[PDB]
Amino acid sequence: NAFSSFDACRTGLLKQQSAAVENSLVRQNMADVRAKALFERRAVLLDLVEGK
Amino acid sequence: QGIKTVYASCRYRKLNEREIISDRYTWLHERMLEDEVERVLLEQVPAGGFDKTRPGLLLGPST
């Protein structure tokens, strides 16, 4: 009756860790893609810029 | 007082010896219990030992 609760809390922590890893990966990848897109936009704007 | 002090000196010497040996025997008893526990634990190790290269529990993707 006590090992049940212990195992429940245990599996909860494990699931927390897995979900954290997955969500962090997703967020990181989205941010990196956005940064790359911004870099390309800046490249085209520098090709279009004018002055001296 | 001098007679009592002589007797007490002898008794205290013997008692110090006995106390040291007793504490060391207690230490040894505890360590032997630990050794028994370890000998029983080593039976649960899988055949071939542990794979110390990888993690025991893989708890997330690696993409």
Given resolution (angstroms): 2.8
Encoding tokens for residue A19? 């979900």
Would you call B59 an interface residue with chain A, using a CB distance cutoff of 8 Å? yes
Shortest distance, CA B56 to any CA of chain A (angstroms): 13
The tokens describing A40, both together, are 């390309």
- Both structure tokens of A41: 């936009």
Amino acid at A50: E
Residue carrying structure tokens 């230490």: B27
CA-nearest of A9, A12, B54 to B62 is: B54
Buried b (16+ CB within 10 A) or exposed e, A15-32: eeeeeeeeeeeeeeeeee
Query: Is residue B59 packed enough to be buried (19+ CB in 10 Å), middle (13-18) or exposed (0-12)?
Result: middle
- Is residue A24 within 8 Å of residue B61, measured between CB atoms? no
Task: Single out the residue of A26, A48, A28 nearest to residue A36, CA to CA.
Answer: A28
Sign for the CA dihedral angle at A15, A18, A22, A23 comes to positive
Using beta carbons and an 8 Å cutoff, which residues of A are at the interface with B? 14, 17-18, 20-22, 25
